[PDB]
């Protein structure tokens, strides 16, 4: 149960500097192996951008670099560009059961452009649907930044995780970001309820829009 | 040039077999390592297992221990994963990539898999009826199977506050996509909105207007 341990996110602005640490036990890291670091963009297969501990392949810009000590494993880079936007992972050899093991990853947000909170926007099941035999509740979440929301959906007060597809964010034409979160539901499931919520969360503040069978 | 390539994208369906590949080129393949990882949709890479082409010596991740065969034939310089019994679950990015001096220096380009139990099927067209005197509308574009579908707006005159999201693979093995536009709420009953639907595995064209609520 070799484990290796980043930070979900890190963030900051065009020019600046960030670090990203990887933290191990003692079958990983303690045992003296040296960590990796690994660079994937959007749509992309990951790049090697750090090899024992500290070393740059060519092409890799000297703005990257990396460290570690004892048990922890740091990556920096300074000078930070848009294209530098990414997810990050450290990896690393172990003795354990698994031979290789990678840490949960990093995604790097480069704040090139203001934080906004997003737009709710929640339909309710059509009647089309419903004479379908069917229910979706449809929660449209728009022009936000950074591009990470959490979504939770309520039954009434109560929290509801069966049945509930969530898509990642992506581009909107104007830049900013959207995503839509769908709770399906049994014509009588949404019936039976007094109504359903969708609860956004973006930057630690919770926007919510609620829908009721009885409304209109 | 060190390059690893891999067998094209899967469409398979839950309990199939599949084995897809990953071929070296410009060095000795024997001589070192290949890996393979799992990232699927959204989250980590995920290390499945790795081999050793000389002696054909393989190890795996527990999570992955008896649900995958990783094997290889050095002879064509190519490695190996393979299912016996797909899982719906297993739905994935697949990477290769090789263990050298610089550790995962070289990575396979990625193989696609998509397992569902779904066949080709025709999307149901739902209307999603309507902030600074706009309104929001759209078309639910329900259960259908494969990618892609596309969207336009009344036959594509309608470009502006346009987004047409993503798609959800459903636990179903279905899609399901929205496409949603911003627009005047003085136009609303004046102005007639229509998203156009076209599917074409299933050789499915719909037209849905979308109309206000009224209550």
């Known amino acids: 149960q070799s484990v290796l341990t980043q930070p979900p996110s890190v963030s900051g602005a065009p020019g600046q500097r960030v670090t990203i640490s990887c933290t191990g036990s003692?079958?990983?890291?303690?045992?003296?192996?040296?960590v990796h670091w690994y660079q994937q963009l959007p749509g992309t297969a990951p790049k090697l951008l750090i090899y024992?501990?500290?070393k740059r392949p060519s092409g890799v810009p000297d703005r990257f670099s990396g460290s570690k000590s004892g048990t922890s494993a740091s990556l920096a880079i300074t000078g930070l560009q848009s294209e530098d936007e990414a997810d990050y992972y450290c990896?690393?050899?172990?003795?354990?059961?698994?031979?290789?093991?990678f840490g949960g990853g990093t995604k790097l947000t480069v704040l090139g452009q203001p934080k906004a909170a997003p737009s709710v926007t929640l339909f309710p099941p059509s009647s089309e649907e419903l004479q379908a035999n069917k229910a979706t509740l449809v929660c449209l979440i728009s022009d936000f930044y950074p591009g990470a929301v959490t979504v939770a959906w309520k039954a009434d007060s109560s929290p509801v995780k069966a049945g509930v597809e969530t898509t990642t964010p992506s581009k909107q034409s104007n830049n900013k970001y959207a995503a839509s979160s769908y709770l399906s539901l049994t014509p009588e499931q949404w019936k039976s309820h007094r109504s359903y919520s969708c609860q956004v969360t973006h930057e630690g503040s919770t926007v919510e829009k609620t829908v009721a069978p009885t409304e209109c | 040039e060190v390059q690893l390539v891999q067998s094209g994208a899967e469409v398979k369906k839950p309990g199939e077999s599949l084995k897809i590949s990953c071929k070296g080129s410009g060095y000795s393949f024997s001589n070192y390592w290949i890996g393979w990882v799992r990232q699927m949709p959204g989250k980590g890479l995920e290390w499945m297992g790795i081999?050793?082409?000389?002696?054909?010596?393989?190890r795996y991740s527990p999570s992955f221990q008896g649900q995958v065969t990783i094997s290889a034939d050095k002879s064509i310089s190519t490695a190996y994963l393979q299912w016996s019994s797909l899982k719906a679950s297993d739905t994935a990015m697949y990477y290769c990539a090789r263990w050298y001096y610089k550790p995962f220096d070289v990575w396979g380009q990625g193989t696609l898999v998509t397992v569902s139990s779904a066949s080709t099927k025709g999307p149901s067209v739902f209307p999603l009826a309507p902030s600074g005197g706009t309104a929001a509308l759209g078309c639910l574009v329900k259960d259908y199977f494969p990618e892609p579908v596309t969207v336009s707006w009344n036959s594509g005159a309608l470009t502006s506050g346009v987004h047409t999201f993503p798609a959800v693979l459903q636990s179903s093995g279905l899609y399901s996509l929205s496409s949603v536009v911003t627009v005047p709420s003085s136009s609303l009953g004046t102005q007639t909105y229509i998203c156009n639907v076209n599917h074409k595995p299933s050789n499915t064209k719909v037209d849905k207007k979308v109309e206000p609520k009224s209550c």
């Open positions: 990896a690393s050899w172990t003795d354990g059961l698994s031979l290789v093991v």
């Open positions: 003692s079958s990983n890291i303690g045992s003296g192996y040296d």
């Open positions: 081999i050793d082409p000389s002696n054909s010596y393989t």
């Open positions: 024992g501990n500290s």
